[PDB]
Amino acid sequence: LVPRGSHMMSSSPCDQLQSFADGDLPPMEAQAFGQHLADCEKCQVELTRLLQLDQLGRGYIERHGPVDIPWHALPRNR
Ligand SMILES: [Zn+2]
Numbered sequence: 001l002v003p004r005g006s007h008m009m010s011s012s013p014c015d016q017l018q019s020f021a022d023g024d025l026p027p028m029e030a031q032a033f034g035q036h037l038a039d040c041e042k043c044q045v046e047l048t049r050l051l052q053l054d055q056l057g058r059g060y061i062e063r064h065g066p067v068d069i070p071w072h073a074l075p076r077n078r
Pocket of ligand 1: 013014036037040042043
């Protein structure tokens with residue numbers, strides 16, 4: 001149940017990674033395009049294009065990258 005507004009267009013998961021690297025993609029869609037984010041030269045070319053201007057910036061680094069998820073999330077839905 002939603003109003004009518006700007007009609008979106010068709011797009012491919014090789015291009016959707018653009019929103020992923022910019023930091024503007026939701027966690028549900030991040031798994032859905034993730035299957036195509038597998039080993040693909042056309043994907044890596046689109047990703048590295050963004051790193052060429054977003055990774056460019058000495059002083060910004062990381063040294064602790066832990067991977068942990070909350071238990072209350074993923075509710076009993078179908
Ligand atoms: Zn691809």
